[PDB]
Amino acid sequence: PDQLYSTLKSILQQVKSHQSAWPFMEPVKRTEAPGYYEVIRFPMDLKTMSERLKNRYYVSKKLFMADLQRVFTNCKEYNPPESEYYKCANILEKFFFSKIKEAGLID
Ligand SMILES: [Cl-]
């Protein structure tokens, strides 16, 4: 019945439990990232996604995927190519795509 939330909740949990999710668990802090909030204008992280999900913001699959996609693209825009974050972004992205295909949110 409440099917979309349950599906989105399962995917976000899997993504947050993945061994490469750790750079993305919290908002980037100004202190640790020179000039992030000048270059990345729509920041996103998995804690904020968890909140939005709880707050019933994800009324469409499109809104959820756009937010999760933003986590990865923000990462790749800012971090160096062979940095551990960039490697994490693409591994987690690959896992994201695998799971949203398995749930038929893309098909
Ligand atoms: Cl609830």
Cα distances (Å, whole numbers) of residue 95 to 16, 37, 63, 68, 104: 11, 27, 18, 12, 14
Q: Whose CA is closest to 103, among 3, 1, 5, 7?
A: 7
> Containing H/E element for 42?
none
Question: How many CB atoms within 10 Å of residue 73?
Answer: 14
| CATH T-level fold of 1-107 | Histone Acetyltransferase; Chain A (1.20.920)
Per the CB < 8 A criterion, the answer to whether 92 and 21 are in contact is yes
Q: Which residues of 26-43 are buried (b: 16+ CB within 10 A; e: fewer)?
A: eebeeeeeeebeeebeee
Distance 53 CA to ligand 1 centre (A): 9
Start-to-end C-alpha separation, the chain: 21
Q: Whose CA is closest to 100, among 13, 3, 16, 8?
A: 8
Residue tagged 């893309």 (tokens): 106
Distance 4 CA to ligand 1 centre (A): 12
3-state percent helix, strand, coil for the chain, nearest multiple of 5: 65, 0, 35
Distance 2 CA to ligand 1 centre (A): 10
